[PDB]
Symmetry: C2
Subunit: 228 residues, 2 copies
């Protein structure tokens, strides 16, 4: 029974702050801005392996891509750097606005779930460390699909697992590519702006059903919609 | 004998020629290196989700998206200039000699690109190197971007070739990965800001050159290995 609806949250960038990796980019590359290059490269190659029928765990593509991007700049990279990337990736802090919005949405009767590209860790997971894991009834990953978002099977198997119908699900992300993936499967999409994350707009591509400049505004819209 | 299938953007045609537009709009030409992966990422996203728009339009919408991300102002004029520049990239100096060599060596030469067909003249025609090729293929008719398996299979089908007779040439390792997954050979050419991805269990390129001349040496070598 979905209640107000099921809200399926993306984790990296959406809940957890990617700029917390900056220091490592500042040091190794002499420019923190390289973060904004390495990340799309990472997403790109995860969707590449997905399209060609290959799978390696996200953190591993992340390390290979960090190496790749390093070579591209002629920047030196030690096995120490790669381990720190793993450390920082799995320890990203939650945006301050997340816990109050999760509280409000729970109280408004929403079911709350996470769906990430990141492979299962041993405990503690990044959200556990961040102190926000317990807001959610389930924490799912692409590892069981052996394919990255936005492949349809990631969303479909998630809806299966939750015994939910697409009309009852809402994918929440700051990445329009993830909302696009979910909407194409019949889910609703909810966009939350994060610094350096604005929506893409393109003909024939459904827009998000809900948009907020931050998680609190998005929760205003999701809650408003229950009675609107 | 062997069919070499060349990626076009970045590989044959010089992407850094877009720099002055990134300089002007963003106060930093390096933003080129953020925009371009976002573009490829979104093309692949559309393909994965059953959506399609031409590459040049994804390019424009991603350019706007990245502008907003930087809080940089962007007018319809800036977008128009992106189109013009995307369709006018010059050939790297090393291309015509390498292609002359490969042709004289007996290779069939073919191009394959994500970019939609335009009215003549094409980017390759303007650069003066189109005529080295026997065919210019695009993903357009199939409405799926590289590296979706069907792009390569439909290419082999179109050329009446089997996978063993084909070698994908790109500075984009994701494109060589795409082709090798369908049993093609892959040939990687370093271009500035492109180095190979090395990842466990992902096939490496069959051939690697630090430029198109060196790549052509290795391909000419494997003729009687």
């Amino acid at each position: 029974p979905s209640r107000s609806g099921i809200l399926v949250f993306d984790v990296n960038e959406t809940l957890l702050d990617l700029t917390s990796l900056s220091p490592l980019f500042e040091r190794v590359f002499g420019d923190a801005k390289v973060l904004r290059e390495w990340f799309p490269e990472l997403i790109l190659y995860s969707q590449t392996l997905t399209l060609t029928g290959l799978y390696r765990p996200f953190g591993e593509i992340a390390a290979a891509v960090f190496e790749m991007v390093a070579a591209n700049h002629q920047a030196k990279v030690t096995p120490d750097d790669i381990a720190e990337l793993k450390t920082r990736l799995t320890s990203m802090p939650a945006y301050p606005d997340v816990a109050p919005a999760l509280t409000r949405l729970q109280d408004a009767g929403f079911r709350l779930v996470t769906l990430t590209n990141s492979a299962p860790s041993p405990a503690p997971s990044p959200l556990e460390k961040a102190g926000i894991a317990s807001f959610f009834e389930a924490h799912l990953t692409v590892h069981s699909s052996q394919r990255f978002k936005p492949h349809p099977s990631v969303y479909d198997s998630t809806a299966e697992t939750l015994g939910a119908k697409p009309e009852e699900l809402c994918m929440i992300a700051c990445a329009i590519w993830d909302t696009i993936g979910a909407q194409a499967r019949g889910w609703r999409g909810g966009f939350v702006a994060r610094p350096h994350n604005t929506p893409l707009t393109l003909a024939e591509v459904p827009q998000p059903d809900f948009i907020g400049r931050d998680m609190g505004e998005l929760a205003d819209q999701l809650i408003a919609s229950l009675t609107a």
